[PDB]
Structure 1
Amino acid sequence: MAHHHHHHAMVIDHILKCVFDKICKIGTESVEAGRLIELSQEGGGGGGPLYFVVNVIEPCKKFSELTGLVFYLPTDSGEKMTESKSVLKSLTEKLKKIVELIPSTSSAVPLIGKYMLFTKEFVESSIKITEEVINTHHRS
């Protein structure tokens, strides 16, 4: 724990590897539970399994830059982070219409709903981590 060190840039930019590390793990872990749960019910669907990652990572890409604007150009406790939660929630909006493209298994529809929000909830870690810097900064 830093004592006199009040500045944040060299040691604050490293913490990013903590949130960016799991992001790479859960990223591939979700691709499994998503195809494992679906196939279990029927696995129905038009496009292939490559579209799920191409349509999901597509929007996530533009958001990836946010992970660098929070650990580099901080504007608040979650100014740039609050926008990361709107990118995942607003994205599904277009993924829900997929039912008009190649609908399949109406039982798995409500099921995946728990897996979709799951990845969105984990994103909160960005703030849960910084919460440790606000307790030391305001104390130091």
Structure 2
Amino acid sequence: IAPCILITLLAIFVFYLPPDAGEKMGLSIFALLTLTVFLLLLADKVPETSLSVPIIIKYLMFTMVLVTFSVILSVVVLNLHHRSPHTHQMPLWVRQIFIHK
């Protein structure tokens, strides 16, 4: 539980990392790799029946989904950041929402 909480905290803190550092992908994806290691840890302990899902497995899969979405949204942010000005024209509504409001 405590390693999962720490990994979740790092997944949160990825979004404060500046795009110019070039380190969002490494942090988020290594968090996912660590969570896979903890899945391997749990593989030897959890029950093997199929009538319901253990709550710890639910928490682990919730954490993995969170880290996956952190990777996805970091990719989206980097796509916006590294967008070529001459090839890509900013639509006006993007300006009104994300620069003014």
What TM-score do you get using the length of structure 1 for normalisation?
A: 0.41
Q: Within 1, Cα distance between the matches of 2:60 and 2:12?
A: 23
| Residue 90 of structure 2: aligned partner | none
1:25-62 residue CA offsets vs partner (Å, 9 max, x unmatched): xxxxxxxxxxxxxxxxxxxxxxxxxxxxxxxx322122
Residue 65 of structure 1 aligns to a residue whose secondary structure is helix
Letter in 2 for 1:93: L
| Residue 3 of structure 2: aligned partner | 59
Shift of 1:123: 2.2
- Corresponding residue to 2:35 among 88, 95, 107: 88
Shift of 1:93: 2.1
| Residue 49 of structure 2: aligned partner | 107
Unaligned runs of 5+ in 1: 1-56
Q: Within 1, Cα distance between the matches of 2:13 and 2:61?
A: 23
Assess, with a 3 A threshold, how the Cα gap between structure 1 residues 122 and 72 changes in structure 2: closer, same or farther: closer
**How many residues align structurally?**
78
| Residue 67 of structure 2: aligned partner | 123
Q: Within 2, Cα distance between the matches of 1:82 and 1:133?
A: 15
Unaligned runs of 5+ in 2: 86-101
Q: Within 2, Cα distance between the matches of 1:107 and 1:87?
A: 25
Shift of 1:85: 0.6
Spell out structure 1 runs of 4+ moving beyond 3 A.
114-118
What TM-score do you get using the length of structure 2 for normalisation?
A: 0.53
